[PDB]
């Protein structure tokens, strides 16, 4: 759970750059595939 | 046969048709991940 949102999967390193204020990021087909985390502000791919 | 090797390296238009219409299928069911259908929201969750 990253402040709302709420799901299940492994969480990886990633190496894409977010806008700073964007705070997660959509697929095609519309499916949450990364995150920032809040406290550190770094962002974290979400794989099944 | 030399120009046979022209016209292509400069047509699939068969082969290119059935590959878009079953992705544009299969995206249409994802899509539908996300409809009420006359429902509250789309989320079990919620
Ligand atoms: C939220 O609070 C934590 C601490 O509660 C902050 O963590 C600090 O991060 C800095 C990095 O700039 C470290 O030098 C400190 O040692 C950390 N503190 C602790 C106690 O670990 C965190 O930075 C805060 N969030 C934001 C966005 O600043």
Request: net charge negative.
């Amino acid at each position: 759970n990253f402040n709302g949102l709420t799901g299940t999967g492994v969480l990886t390193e990633s190496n894409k750059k977010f806008l700073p204020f964007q705070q997660f990021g959509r697929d095609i087909a519309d499916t949450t595939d990364a995150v920032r985390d809040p406290q550190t502000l770094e962002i974290l791919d979400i794989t099944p | 046969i030399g120009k046979i090797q022209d016209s292509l390296s400069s047509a699939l238009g068969k082969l290119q048709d059935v590959v878009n219409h079953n992705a544009q299928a299969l995206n249409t069911l994802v899509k539908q991940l996300s409809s009420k259908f006359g429902a509250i929201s789309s989320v079990l969750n919620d």
